[PDB]
Design a protein around this ligand. Structure first.
Ligand SMILES: CC(C)(COP(=O)(O)OP(=O)(O)OC[C@H]1O[C@@H](n2cnc3c(N)ncnc32)[C@H](O)[C@@H]1OP(=O)(O)O)[C@@H](O)C(=O)NCCC(=O)NCCS
Ligand SMILES: CC(C)(COP(=O)(O)OP(=O)(O)OC[C@H]1O[C@@H](n2cnc3c(N)ncnc32)[C@H](O)[C@@H]1OP(=O)(O)O)[C@@H](O)C(=O)NCCC(=O)NCCS
Ligand SMILES: CC(=O)N[C@@H]1[C@@H](O)[C@H](O)[C@@H](COP(=O)(O)O)O[C@@H]1O
Ligand SMILES: CC(=O)N[C@@H]1[C@@H](O)[C@H](O)[C@@H](COP(=O)(O)O)O[C@@H]1O
Lengths: 165, 165
């Protein structure tokens, strides 16, 4: 239930050193359903009603793929989840069988925003991607939050195109 | 060796119906190393020297994940690979445990460009993503080829940001 989704060794030591006092950044675990996890994702977009059995099923799917999916959380001093971020590592044939990190689903609870937690999440995900051998990490953002990603050390690389069903 | 990476049933019947005569669109198979596959990817970006043992290893990795990675090719009337495209299906918690299709590594050999093959590749990948239950498909492009993606029925959705290592 409390077993980390991936090795705690993958959490950037430099990030841990600079986090506000008593806050923590760590891999997701299964019991995080019960600690406010989904409620954090709701600041970002539509989540829907998900029951515990559904959470468990999808968590186990991700856990079986913990060499691809790296989901982590920021917890406050009371152990509540207040921030989320994901990295998905894509395998390619190009770049000599390279790998590309994709940052996804970045969210910080409204009352906890503007305190560098989002920056620390991005820094942690970048550390994972580099460490496992990705040649780059990419993500998509809006015009309204491009400046956040700039402050995280990302640079504009192209355009996101979409087809919704 | 010739076993398709994923079910031929996932190849859009409407796309097959409109492809130029004798051309085919079909899943990757292992023996495609020997049919010009990597040489097509070279129009898109850096590929590097990859030997057959390396190809086989990475192919098997992808094949073990054929519910995530959908790589397909266009072959000309002589069975040479002249086009490539990939779809990677990401699992989420948001959108009621939704899935997002990601189009990647789109390439058509120089002498075969401007004949709707790229359009057919995109159409085929969109069909896979919808059929397996994705709520949308996204991709990143440059300003210079945005117009191609527009002609494929994609619309601008945001900005691609990157951090290279
Ligand atoms: C986008 C989001 C993930 C950013 O997380 P956050 O913890 O609020 O942001 P941080 O404090 O880590 O941001 C780092 C920096 O980017 C700034 N920033 C945050 N969002 C920004 C935005 N949309 N546009 C411009 N700058 C932004 C912060 O003020 C801070 O700037 P600073 O270095 O001058 O103090 C969060 O606001 C969210 O989930 N929003 C919805
Ligand atoms: C980008 C790429 C994959 C497109 O594939 P392609 O097979 O050459 O393109 P298609 O013929 O399928 O293109 C569909 C349409 O987009 C057009 N198009 C192709 N690339 C374009 C570009 N970069 N910008 C604007 N339009 C473009 C084609 O001319 C065609 O237009 P039409 O419907 O008026 O005939 C290919 O050129 C490539 O690999 N380039 C590197
Ligand atoms: C860096 C980051 O947080 N990117 C996310 C992406 O991960 C998520 O899939 C999407 C959901 O938006 P949607 O509900 O309209 O698909 O929003 C943003 O693009
Ligand atoms: C739609 C499409 O074809 N997208 C590709 C992407 O799949 C690939 O990973 C990248 C490689 O570029 P890079 O060599 O600079 O990483 O180019 C384009 O963004």
């Amino acid at each position: 239930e409390n077993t980390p989704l991936f090795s705690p060794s993958l959490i950037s030591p430099d990030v841990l050193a600079v986090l506000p006092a008593d806050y923590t950044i760590r891999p997701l675990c299964r019991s995080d359903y019960k600690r406010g996890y989904l409620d954090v994702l709701r600041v970002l977009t539509t989540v829907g009603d998900i029951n515990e059995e559904q959470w468990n099923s999808r968590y186990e799917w991700i856990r079986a793929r913990s060499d691809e999916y790296y989901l982590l959380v920021v917890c406050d001093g009371e152990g509540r989840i207040v921030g989320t971020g994901s990295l998905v590592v894509e395998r390619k044939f190009i770049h000599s069988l390279g790998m590309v990190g994709h940052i996804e689903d970045i969210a910080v609870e409204k009352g906890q925003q503007g305190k560098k937690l989002g920056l620390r999440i991005i820094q942690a995900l970048d550390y994972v991607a580099e460490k496992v051998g990705c040649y780059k990490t990419i993500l998509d953002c809006s015009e309204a939050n491009e400046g956040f990603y700039i402050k995280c050390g990302f640079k504009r690389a192209g355009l996101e195109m979409a087809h919704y069903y």
